[PDB]
Amino acid sequence: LAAKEAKLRDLEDSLARERDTSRRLLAEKEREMAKMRARMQQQLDEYQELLDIKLALDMEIHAYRKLLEGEEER
């Protein structure tokens, strides 16, 4: 037991630090995925909205086309 508390209680010094360093990290990572799952859904909405405009344009495009069918017929 000459240098037992210079090793057993020096092992416990890092187990409180390694547990914590991993934890401060795992959290820092789980925080980053949280925002990333948030951009990844806010972006799906941005697309869903745009598609519903593109579809609404394709609509009129056939109408302006059917209008011309009459206007320009021999």
PDB file of C-alpha atoms in Angstrom:
ATOM      1  CA  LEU A   1       0.000   0.000   0.000  1.00  0.00           C
ATOM      2  CA  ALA A   2       3.121   2.277  -0.386  1.00  0.00           C
ATOM      3  CA  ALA A   3       1.805   3.852  -3.676  1.00  0.00           C
ATOM      4  CA  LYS A   4      -1.787   2.378  -3.680  1.00  0.00           C
ATOM      5  CA  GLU A   5      -3.574   5.773  -3.259  1.00  0.00           C
ATOM      6  CA  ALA A   6      -1.210   7.271  -5.918  1.00  0.00           C
ATOM      7  CA  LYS A   7      -2.867   4.753  -8.385  1.00  0.00           C
ATOM      8  CA  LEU A   8      -6.347   3.576  -7.110  1.00  0.00           C
ATOM      9  CA  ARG A   9      -7.415   7.185  -6.282  1.00  0.00           C
ATOM     10  CA  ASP A  10      -5.573   8.432  -9.492  1.00  0.00           C
ATOM     11  CA  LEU A  11      -7.660   5.897 -11.536  1.00  0.00           C
ATOM     12  CA  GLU A  12     -10.885   7.292  -9.971  1.00  0.00           C
ATOM     13  CA  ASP A  13      -9.656  10.884 -10.876  1.00  0.00           C
ATOM     14  CA  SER A  14      -9.845  10.051 -14.625  1.00  0.00           C
ATOM     15  CA  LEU A  15     -13.077   7.880 -14.320  1.00  0.00           C
ATOM     16  CA  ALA A  16     -14.882  11.039 -13.135  1.00  0.00           C
ATOM     17  CA  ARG A  17     -13.197  12.962 -16.019  1.00  0.00           C
ATOM     18  CA  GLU A  18     -13.504  10.357 -18.871  1.00  0.00           C
ATOM     19  CA  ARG A  19     -17.172   9.641 -17.944  1.00  0.00           C
ATOM     20  CA  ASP A  20     -17.740  13.425 -17.974  1.00  0.00           C
ATOM     21  CA  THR A  21     -15.652  14.186 -21.166  1.00  0.00           C
ATOM     22  CA  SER A  22     -17.662  11.479 -23.014  1.00  0.00           C
ATOM     23  CA  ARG A  23     -20.897  12.841 -21.531  1.00  0.00           C
ATOM     24  CA  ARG A  24     -20.195  16.567 -22.351  1.00  0.00           C
ATOM     25  CA  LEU A  25     -19.481  15.140 -25.868  1.00  0.00           C
ATOM     26  CA  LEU A  26     -22.331  12.655 -26.357  1.00  0.00           C
ATOM     27  CA  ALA A  27     -24.617  15.560 -25.373  1.00  0.00           C
ATOM     28  CA  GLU A  28     -22.807  18.079 -27.721  1.00  0.00           C
ATOM     29  CA  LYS A  29     -23.451  15.459 -30.484  1.00  0.00           C
ATOM     30  CA  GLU A  30     -27.101  14.715 -29.511  1.00  0.00           C
ATOM     31  CA  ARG A  31     -27.578  18.529 -29.588  1.00  0.00           C
ATOM     32  CA  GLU A  32     -26.204  18.721 -33.151  1.00  0.00           C
ATOM     33  CA  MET A  33     -28.537  15.934 -34.456  1.00  0.00           C
ATOM     34  CA  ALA A  34     -31.497  17.737 -32.804  1.00  0.00           C
ATOM     35  CA  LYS A  35     -30.894  20.907 -34.976  1.00  0.00           C
ATOM     36  CA  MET A  36     -30.084  18.652 -37.953  1.00  0.00           C
ATOM     37  CA  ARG A  37     -33.373  16.746 -37.567  1.00  0.00           C
ATOM     38  CA  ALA A  38     -34.970  20.273 -37.383  1.00  0.00           C
ATOM     39  CA  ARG A  39     -33.354  21.668 -40.620  1.00  0.00           C
ATOM     40  CA  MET A  40     -34.186  18.240 -42.285  1.00  0.00           C
ATOM     41  CA  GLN A  41     -37.980  18.804 -41.600  1.00  0.00           C
ATOM     42  CA  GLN A  42     -38.113  22.575 -42.201  1.00  0.00           C
ATOM     43  CA  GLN A  43     -36.556  21.724 -45.579  1.00  0.00           C
ATOM     44  CA  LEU A  44     -39.128  19.020 -46.372  1.00  0.00           C
ATOM     45  CA  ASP A  45     -41.858  21.749 -45.860  1.00  0.00           C
ATOM     46  CA  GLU A  46     -39.948  24.218 -48.084  1.00  0.00           C
ATOM     47  CA  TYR A  47     -40.042  21.491 -50.839  1.00  0.00           C
ATOM     48  CA  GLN A  48     -43.659  20.428 -50.248  1.00  0.00           C
ATOM     49  CA  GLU A  49     -44.713  24.099 -50.654  1.00  0.00           C
ATOM     50  CA  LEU A  50     -42.653  24.575 -53.870  1.00  0.00           C
ATOM     51  CA  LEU A  51     -43.925  21.393 -55.520  1.00  0.00           C
ATOM     52  CA  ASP A  52     -47.520  22.643 -54.846  1.00  0.00           C
ATOM     53  CA  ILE A  53     -46.643  25.876 -56.771  1.00  0.00           C
ATOM     54  CA  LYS A  54     -44.924  23.960 -59.666  1.00  0.00           C
ATOM     55  CA  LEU A  55     -48.034  21.737 -59.921  1.00  0.00           C
ATOM     56  CA  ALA A  56     -50.234  24.938 -59.988  1.00  0.00           C
ATOM     57  CA  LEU A  57     -48.156  26.341 -62.812  1.00  0.00           C
ATOM     58  CA  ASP A  58     -48.415  23.151 -64.887  1.00  0.00           C
ATOM     59  CA  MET A  59     -52.211  23.643 -64.507  1.00  0.00           C
ATOM     60  CA  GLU A  60     -52.435  27.097 -66.104  1.00  0.00           C
ATOM     61  CA  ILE A  61     -49.835  25.996 -68.652  1.00  0.00           C
ATOM     62  CA  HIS A  62     -52.387  23.491 -70.081  1.00  0.00           C
ATOM     63  CA  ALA A  63     -55.108  26.161 -69.836  1.00  0.00           C
ATOM     64  CA  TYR A  64     -53.051  28.765 -71.742  1.00  0.00           C
ATOM     65  CA  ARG A  65     -52.400  25.826 -74.179  1.00  0.00           C
ATOM     66  CA  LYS A  66     -56.161  24.930 -74.537  1.00  0.00           C
ATOM     67  CA  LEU A  67     -56.908  28.668 -75.008  1.00  0.00           C
ATOM     68  CA  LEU A  68     -54.507  28.752 -77.955  1.00  0.00           C
ATOM     69  CA  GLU A  69     -56.066  25.550 -79.472  1.00  0.00           C
ATOM     70  CA  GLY A  70     -59.154  27.658 -80.256  1.00  0.00           C
ATOM     71  CA  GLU A  71     -57.466  31.054 -80.978  1.00  0.00           C
ATOM     72  CA  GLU A  72     -55.094  29.499 -83.563  1.00  0.00           C
ATOM     73  CA  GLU A  73     -57.209  26.914 -85.527  1.00  0.00           C
ATOM     74  CA  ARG A  74     -57.562  26.563 -89.381  1.00  0.00           C
TER      75      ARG A  74
END
